[PDB]
Amino acid sequence: MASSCAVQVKLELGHRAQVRKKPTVEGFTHDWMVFVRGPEHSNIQHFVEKVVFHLHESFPRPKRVCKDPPYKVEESGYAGFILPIEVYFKNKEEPRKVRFDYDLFLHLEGHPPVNHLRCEKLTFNNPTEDFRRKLLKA
């Protein structure tokens, strides 16, 4: 064939973290929320099978699986950690997923709450016709 193709999609990873007015009965001092979305409320669900948040093993049911948007997790905690996030694609051929190590950090009391955003671009070179159609429907 004479044609080649490169499709590029943008994802926004991010988290919010606030010091609680009163710690939970467990001692947890913060409420946080972490998420994967697309920009402009894009419909990434067209090409995203599921999003998996790998919480620290200290949390109950550490493998949090989101098969349908919003792709997010809301918890309380007391300490920052690295949170591996895996985005699975509605694809049959490589790549079938992409992994990002998300820095879930928390700020001390007396400092402002955390609102963090991290932009990531994914580039698919010569996707199949059906993966390509889903990618571009987003």
Binding site: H30, H56, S58, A79, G80, F81, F105, L106, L108, H111
Partner: peptide
């Protein structure tokens, strides 16, 4: 630091 302690 502005951050809390961390876990691994």
């Amino acid at each position: 630091t502005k951050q809390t302690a961390r876990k691994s």
